[model samples]
Target: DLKPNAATRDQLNIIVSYPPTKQLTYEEQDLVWKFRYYLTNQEKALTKFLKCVNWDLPQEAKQALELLGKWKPMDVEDSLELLSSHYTNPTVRRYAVARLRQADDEDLLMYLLQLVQALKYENFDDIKNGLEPINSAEIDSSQIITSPLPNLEQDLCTFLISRACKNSTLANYLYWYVIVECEDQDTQQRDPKTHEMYLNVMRRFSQALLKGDKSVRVMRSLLAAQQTFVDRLVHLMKAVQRESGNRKKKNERLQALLGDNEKMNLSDVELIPLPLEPQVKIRGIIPETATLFKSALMPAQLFFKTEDGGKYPVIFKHGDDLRQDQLILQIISLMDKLLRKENLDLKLTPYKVLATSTKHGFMQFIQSVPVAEVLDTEGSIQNFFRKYAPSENGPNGISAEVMDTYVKSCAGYCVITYILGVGDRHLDNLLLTKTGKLFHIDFGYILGRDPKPLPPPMKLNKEMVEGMGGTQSEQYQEFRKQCYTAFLHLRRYSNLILNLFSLMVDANIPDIALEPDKTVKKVQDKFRLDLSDEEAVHYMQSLIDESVHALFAA
Candidate 1:
């Protein structure tokens, strides 16, 4: 079976040459399945090979299952890929779950968001009708394999529950992540099947947590502590904003309010794990460090004291729908992982964002200055870098490392923002760090909606290009090359991105809710799936050219 005839061999050669993104034909699938053993070493062939198996045929399914054991193991990234919507076969997904079991708790925590999303791809009907209740006692057993293959949902829940019981940090995030999904379903009032599935998972999670050795009281205390903290912070912000006077008067009132220990009512809980950074154990808040920003919403910046005496700074915003920002940050973080998996690290800085509710949330406070401020003060992006990271023997009198970071991150955001159709590209929303990392904030306009007339496809301003020593410099050429490479690489995972967006069509994020029917198509069209790889390269180049040229007319 491993060997092929002369004509079949020729066909196999041709099929193997085809890109992994290609949709394999039925004849090609059958041909590839026949010689899977010979293609085991080829990593790119794994996705295609898994697709070749006809799961309906018991004999063929059994053979494919057995071959999975013989084939080389996949890395964590590839294992995650196998769980995407494109691979719907339960057997394949179960295999992916088994591989995922090999990842340690920290590694598992890193990919937990996408793993939760993967649950959306599971067949909810099977979970609703045929799935048996997981016994509390057997939940901790090492050898609790069920008869026949277990569904991906069951396997994933069991794994998460067991791990969460052992690590409270993991448990904290798992609980919130699942609870948020359930709340989203409730608010949206859509997809009863998904709601039921989430409810079942939550039920199991709670039961398991209660029965486990870990103290459920600690979890309850932390939840109460966080709720109290948010309430007090919101009250303090409102009180300060109401003080109609100069900035000094507002600061004095904020200080006086924060000084009142009884009014703050912040308890010394075991661990106040923020959703933004779940790994940190915040024991209490430094009330004196809280300061209110001078904005319409008057967001407060405060520092939380960690168990190790370190401080974690966070910005708490109220009266704004952070759900949209949360969704955008989550997608950006996922895209960062995908790009890193392909060994293409564009130095993207995906800061943590968490929405506790529709009107309130927390964002990790990154130290950076707005690009608009930098331009007004330094005259050009290059001069800003030269001021912060100057070097005698470096390009444009800036440190080589800083310049490299600038080029790569700029290229990364250019491709990402373009694909997401992120509008509002004024320099005010764009930020630059001292170390030369450029990132955008305030994603109020996305999916092609813009307040400004005739915004460019991506925010590749002439100053940014000139920051890298102009169009003729080696650094500028490198930036364009990276843009093309990143685009072509992302095109390979078009289905994965499209599937994730489709799953969120009913989540009711602001921009997405505006056009729920066309949300997926809006994202799908950005991938330009109609073009081949070569054509995509040309298209990406043209986009860069257009974005760069638009600044001249402005």
Candidate 2:
């Protein structure tokens, strides 16, 4: 209810006049702090006000903290922003979590990846002091009080656990996320305290999940289904490899192997949840549809029959540590959600990837052909689209819908790959669907690590631009515009992404493991935090131009 004095009003005016993108100086922040209550009506003012409170000054901090109680509720997105590293105050994080309580479970699930990663930002000193061996029986009854402070991680764990008990899909993912963290040996070695907390949480989760009769039955059957799927696929892969014949002969051998029910043990099993895709329940694999790839690993692609008679195709790969790919795909999926929340849809295809073990995993198989194959047969990407997705009434003899999807997906991948530092891009790894969606596969290198020397910052190849009808085409212009917009939009959430990456530093992802200490910094550098929004646009433009004119080294 306080009104600003003349002098204070003048200061407020000046502060409000400053560009929102500009970093506030200490003095400027102090002024904002003085008028914090007066600016509560402005939605944008909350973020700036949160930044101004100097926690070092105990007296001022106390007043600012108390004032937060009377302030207007923050937007959900603003609440997420407050959870980032920029705001370290427990009270502030608690406030953000309180606001997040308003979000529905589905919305919460969308950001679950980053929210789980946010646990890394929590201070575990309180837990370390009060640590004790977790009693499995007492876990479900809440006999332990790990922290006295307003612990964000504890709150998050409790919220997730309760919600997971009600939702099977959520339970499945939460289980996997915690299991992955618990199994991270590198994290355990680097920070035993946090690992201990994870172990405790996993135990609690296991007890709660197993206590439910329905979930217990589901879990057991899912494990059995996973075992059977892996065993049969492994045998099929070995048998196919042993046949030293032509493609037709190899196909015949695979069919024969699949037909031998006694030897292969390929039969319809009881309906169970697929570990890879938790939402779907599979009865068994379609043996006739199983085919082996020509790769060194001899990965098998098979279609599984769901309860509703829907066929789901997945690629089961052996001898490859899919953890790296899984991490990259998870990040991509998170970024896609963030972009969609901002109403900037780029048509990203973040296919499902799950690492069942270190040596094998499952990947959702999208029907798409490699850009290299298209280039070899049709000469150019434009010709491939022109031949397949052609429409006489559409622009450039390509279906308008297909062209739009191609342009948007191309722009999406370009910005995402640049931000994530995804490497080893070539025509072979870049795939395009018949409907004109472009996506990258085989994330062997990320975080600026590349096997090839002098890789472009973004993969805006000539063929891609040519597919858009050339650099001067309208579609190309739209591509550039979307790229800049997406880049700026993602920059807004840079802290969230940086925090997520910081948490994964000790996860032992292949590329990040190479330089664990520098992982977060490597990602931070790509965001170009030093540049203004306008400057960032020009920077992104330069990257596009550079990638366009660069040699076809790949």
Candidate 3:
């Protein structure tokens, strides 16, 4: 299916025909409207479609071509250029990058890696001004909800979901957004995370309706095509429900997991139901907090009440905080002198946010980030770490136990971030208490870093070789026992994340709204992953390695 030329030719013949024509109907235009999907199905098809797309196409197709082509990047290099260089629509730009996931070309993959490089040179421009160079994107609301959409909304969503249910590529894209960018309860377990659903929905519109394979790139063909809209999230949720039913067993199919029972009712959000305990509290929903618009988000505040029952500053959650769980783990590693204990009770605050949009609105908690006392706070954990880190004047140098502990910490967070596609974990989000232990702080910026043709690069600590346990030396191997402990812990926790995802997938929360007592066919659709129970765990670990390499290695 990754075969490009065949997929492209088949799509053209079945949908638009080879050599192209001007005599097609408006209905035929619908097929052409979705031509990008075919093109992105395989690499050869992508290049072939790009080459075959008559720049001077017929009216409707031509209009679609124009807008889509504006951003329809042919390869990863093109995507990298567009992503790192454009701020026109950061969301769309991110989408283009998402599409690059299917890219097999080495050069294209490197191009798609622009975010890391861009982050490496973050000093060149201020973050606020960095978005100035990208192409400007128009936010179309109709793309969010289709039954209530302007046009092609439901068609596009059904099309995407249909393909995703069958095609691994599209399914992968869906997972990245849902698991990575969505900011769910499991991800924000250590921090309270929040986001602006409406703003993000506009951005996702361009991605879902226009981008290829959910990649932000579009060919010139789809620019002026009718925009898709979903005025109501509930309807769209049901639509996804029907499609997701295809993956269930006959008995399960009758259960209607895709339909929503609650009629868009989301009130207070909390983290007690979360898989991992977060150590942060959060608030602050900005109009510009339109970061994630897809699935699996965790938005909740965290708090730690003192013995006297006084609520104190522990974790802060807001629109700007997305990956606080990663930060929390990082901080725990840095402040290991105090936190590496077994069953240590830590006071914390948390925030839970629920987000919805016409595009993919369902009543679900969105995101969370943990906020500890800032690095500069007096008597904060940062102060605690400073007093103990391996320094000339400190107690001792970094040891095998310390290094192994750091690696374990890094591995856990790195794995989750990779699954989430959080290309946004940088120094700003990683913090240390005064005690010198690491903590990943804020959780904003996700699935791919902020729009950067050249983004930041991540890696395992190369310096760890010099630190201690990374080496095979006797002293290090002596400490390597702890390394084994840490890695084993990583394996254990990875299982927790997997089980949590399973909880969501297998929960028999059938939508009674769709079929009360199985009177009729209840349709439901959601992103369905094909990985078997065993495969998911192993493959997810591979994803973690890639992430760790990206973060610390060249």
Candidate 4:
């Protein structure tokens, strides 16, 4: 079907040279440069060129980008256009876009804005073919913020920061791609055309990101909100129930067996329930309920202590457990819907609906969860953190075991988030459970991104020294441990992670947000790093080489 030649046939090979002095044994500039080269020619070299881009930059990713500026290996506009207009793969596009954005090209920023506007023009096919949810709408959380973006006080950005600079544009492109290009390929073709369309969309969108205008406010308006407990309760009460031919497990519901059981054959992953909550179209938060909302979900955690002593996925509410075992129950519920616990206040455990009340009121509990603990009354984790993470007297170092688990968990989550276009990952909004368990509490920020595209977290704030109460705080050391650990672990799954991202494109989860380079490059450029510009990217070669080696098994 295709012809091959020496240039194309011969693969790009990377040999690690260990030089002791320059100690480039780990420099970021050279690493980025080489890795960028590998991405451009990714189609041919594949794994050979990208074997080492998983963790943090050996030197500094930003510094490497700056060095590229000196080398002048690429023209900003040319690289941006190439990254946006032609690159068909997501990772390639991501690297290119990251590099282009790294330099702060005014044009690329402008293009990203224009694409954001295109989001309003939703097409039917885009909705149908663009995003194919393996189970629940991929994620039931979906929405485009209405114009005049409601008061910034509640704006998602105000509440949480974006994962990368071009999130809105990238998110918008997903919407546009789904609207304009999506078509059901499975009905007639084999895999489906969405993935290819996603590729085309990535390239075109990236070009637009570079050339289009950027109206930050325009893209920021509105958000996809999740259905609340009240909404779920109200909806299920009045909605019609259609029978899904699913078989329940032995411990519970034989009631669901009434569906066309004979014809049903289940896949490994079953369709989970998304209560068709009657989204009462009425807007604006109800004043009465709004005030209590935050406090209500707080004070929840370690509810799982009742089950496995301290295993992760333990329950966490604002600051206390509505039920003692609620945390673990929620975890199991997510895996199997039949076991779902009641809302934050109550739970049906062991066939009984238990009410575990708090005397401090709801607001106190909400405030507690985001901090280091859940129960203000008992205040286990919070007190633990206050004692450790504070700048005051405490243990200063983190053990390697704890460090390893946190990084691996974060890396896994990052991969999932990337493929899902998850735009936010905040320190406060995220948590690491004891026994090295990591979890994401807020699911509100995902499923839309590049509406544009990094490596090494940009908001690397070292000020935690004070927050941790000097180097003496356990919290401080844990934070550092996580950073060193996570930074190193990022390399372990670069290709697999990239490949996972590729799956999203080929799968067309929510329309193709253009080829990868353009989509991700927007991000790189946002933070001022460029993975496409050879000079910029190649500069980080040593960083990629060494960081990855340290992170994974070379």
Candidate 5:
């Protein structure tokens, strides 16, 4: 059903029509307080409790909104017991942390601390402020479990600080303090990559805790780092434009090929240029600490070596040509940041992407690639998945740590691209890593802008869905559930999203610039936020189903 108009929505009946979808009333709020911890079905009980409040009674609903925060989760004991259970896996146990408080139990504290260290400190930069490089040392697998902490008094700081330096408020006021402190003391400059990574970790832990409060310090530090990153990126891009490759000789070659008198205009030609020779400027910024695999052409690639001497690919896109891709990507990141705030388990694998325009051209910086190699062949994504990520139950047996990356990575890429209206899908830009993460590249087309006529919103082909064990299978169904949930989450913030895109209306982006005012409306229409909750779900289900079938003949 289409949701009622304002007058009808606020009627006496259907007061609790939206449990979490809408706010509650205070007399009804007291009813919520009366049964705050309703056994195992607290969420269901909370839904029922909403009816106790009257939407028509403004005073009652208003009281519920104010008093609801005073309500806490069922006590720490029940939550802690869930964490202690032998049968509970990491995912469930991690979730149980949400209902928990800062417990006195050292054992429980240790478990919480260890759960947070899934990602270890991969590499660290050792540089001083405006001075020559000092020393750079790569850290071990994980500092949380490996780095020894001092035996100190039993307190919040003592417990969490002993494990890892992070910003989860479930610890204390000191977790973020130490991370920022470490950065300041070590390099005298904070890095945004580190800041962003810490923020994601904090988000996960904070979301797990029902009443978790993230430290204000984390925000302050992240803002500073983001400013610094933006400035540095802009500066570096300008430097590249000033000092890097010039295509003057190539232009001469083109003129010679046309034989001067040939009046045929070849402006529409899309030929790949000859490789740019190794230049002094490229050597300067790329550094001498490690080797880099160079592919010198349009949207050129330089695979920078990590501390462990592994490859870290960087793609240099043409600033003038793909400004839309950069702009849309930032929009995606903004959505990502917002979704994380709500603690939705959505991972949009957005790399470190930056670009700037110069009189000569657009200079771009993209930390790229998750693929062992971009698969080139006759088989679909499922064939490739089996070749890389064979499950224990599958025909080809697996060893260890195989399942972590596939489903979540695929689900995230599918839903995010669909919502952003990314187009121009081909296997060349769709990559899958050996570890099982699948992600898309090359955002040249966005907002339903594709040279090809009315292509599907994304590359969610039958082969892709089959990779997760067919649409009817549990894995594939769960993937769809995740997609539906993430879609709704994005819809919740439609106004903020629409407003943000509206601000970008005047920018010279390609697809959006052509229809600036309609851009926001295009995105807003996808959300269908005006629809009732039940109606919205049905709409999403049909949309997903239709999109899949629509792309089938392709």
Candidate 6:
């Protein structure tokens, strides 16, 4: 909404003809001189005319501003200093701020810091709504040290910590963003006093992060301090459990069938089981463990029972399985949650997963599962689906409930896995519940790390597709439609997903660490972000074609 006296800022209609190359005619100069009054009196007109002379020319932009009769600048260092200073009226100052928002790289940091400083006194609507700087607190330090600063350092910590205590979301995001930026070899090189401030900053935010993901999350401080150590007792215990035949399986199954929810006594292991929470918090080291499991990429899993003696099942895997693999799972799960959160037609089962490093390995806990046995029978998945699925949707046939669940879950996993570049796809790691939802596990190879060379992004095999009654079936068509819908929905968050990966670049998480920029670029490449929606769909459809081909390939 412009005011009554607002200037018409459209460009002059002076065209240039070509001799050998395109050349501006004197008519351009004629129009500028002829319309100089409008170009000067009108703010928009003046700004546009300034561009004709030389937009970044400070002396020129100043004269143009003065001509516009709004900015009467003399003491200012440059047009930028004029904009950031208090002498200008609010509306004119706001206009200056708006112009400086497009400030070039050389002065961007300085201008941003200036903007951050000016925010307290001025109700700069654009800063509040657009850039959203933390302006309420008085920063202790006068000098700026960090680029793209949320918190510059100790001075930064002071402002950030103050705002965080008051529950400012912008401040919190700033603090974490800085911490993520600091995840590199240079992190250790921080000055000692600033280093302590960094630790304090981390510990406070670490508590917040841990508290936010309460049911489970990474233990940051302790994890950083602890070096991974090989615990043969853990390895031996896993081996015994692993080799304990079908006898243990049978007993576990029998107990499950009997609805036995009581805790089982670990007769021989004398250590007290670690509670779900770190009841006794220790600094710089993982507290003593009370449980262990077969490591996915690590040394053990922790088994704990709730106060009611109900089994608390969580899988803890180590480093070889912890890094890039964990990030992939986290991303997949986040995508799933995002899809479902928007009330879209897609449904996905995302389990709780987190990773933290230790002396011996990276250890992470996977949330417990439903009380269903793994679908690991002899027949193909197609045969199993047919056997359990009713021939018709009725009481006498397969229940409509079962039919919907099967189709929906299949569509979600197939579509998302393909888009995410999930690899190492095989029957062994794919799990199906008695309830009919299909989910994936063990994401050790993803983002095109297929053991089979030139593999399609998804494992939409005959067994899985046939279970939906072949490509000709209505269910299969519905599955494809769901896939297309989910794909489009996910594109909306491509930047967010890519940003998350970029932050984890210095994490040294195996595949991701191999080439941080390249890894980020690879994920960005998958999104085909450069293309328009119509063209992007065509590319995705081609992937689907390849996925179907692989499924039906001889």
Best of the candidates, TM-score: 2
Could you give the candidate ranking by TM-score, starting with the highest?
Answer: 2, 1, 6, 5, 4, 3
Taking all chains together, each candidate's TM-score versus the true structure is 0.74, 0.76, 0.27, 0.29, 0.47, 0.53
Candidate scoring better on TM-score of 1 and 4: 1
| Candidate with the larger TM-score of 2 and 4 | 2
- Give one digit per residue, the lDDT tens place, for model 6 in 455-498: 76656766677556677877777777776667777777664565
How close to the true structure is residue 443 of candidate 3, measured as C-alpha lDDT?
43
Query: What's the residue-level lDDT of 309 in candidate 2?
Result: 88
Q: Roughly what TM-score does model 3 have, to 2 decimal places?
A: 0.27
Tens-place lDDT digits, model 1, residues 1-554: 37668887677776765543456899888778778987776665576677776677888878877777677776665677677756666777777888777788866766665576676667666544433444232322111111112223445666676777777677766766665565563433556567567656666665555455547645544544555566677677777878998767777787777667676654344566765686787876676677777677877787778878888888888777676777788778878888898999888888887765556678988888888889889998889988889999999899999999999999999999998999988888888998989898888999988998876677678778878898889898999999999998888877667655655655667788789777777887777877889999999999888777777677
Name the better of 2 and 6 by lDDT: 2
Candidate 2 lDDT tens digits, 1-554: 67789988777776654432356899888778767878777665677776777778887778877777777776766777666656667777777777777888877776665566565555555323333334422332111212112223435555666677777777666666665565565666777666667666655555555556786546634544555655576677677877897666776777777667678765466776776888888877776777778776767787888999899998988767788998889888888998999998788899998865456678999999999999899998878889888899987999999999999999999999998888888899999998999999999989787888977678677788888998778999999999999999898878667656755655667898788777777777888887899999999999988777774444
What is candidate 4's local distance difference test score?
A: 0.29
Q: Please state the error at residue 386 of candidate 4 in Å.
A: 6.6
Check candidate 1 and list the clashing pairs. none
For lDDT, the strongest prediction is 2
Q: Clashes in candidate 3: how many?
A: 152
For candidate 1, the per-residue lDDT at 435 reads: 92
Candidate 4: segments with Cα more than 4 A from true spot? 1-368, 372-428, 432-438, 443-485, 506-517, 520-554
Task: Report the lDDT of model 4 for residue 83.
Answer: 31
Stretches of candidate 5 off by over 4 Å are: 1-297, 303-312, 318-322, 358-404
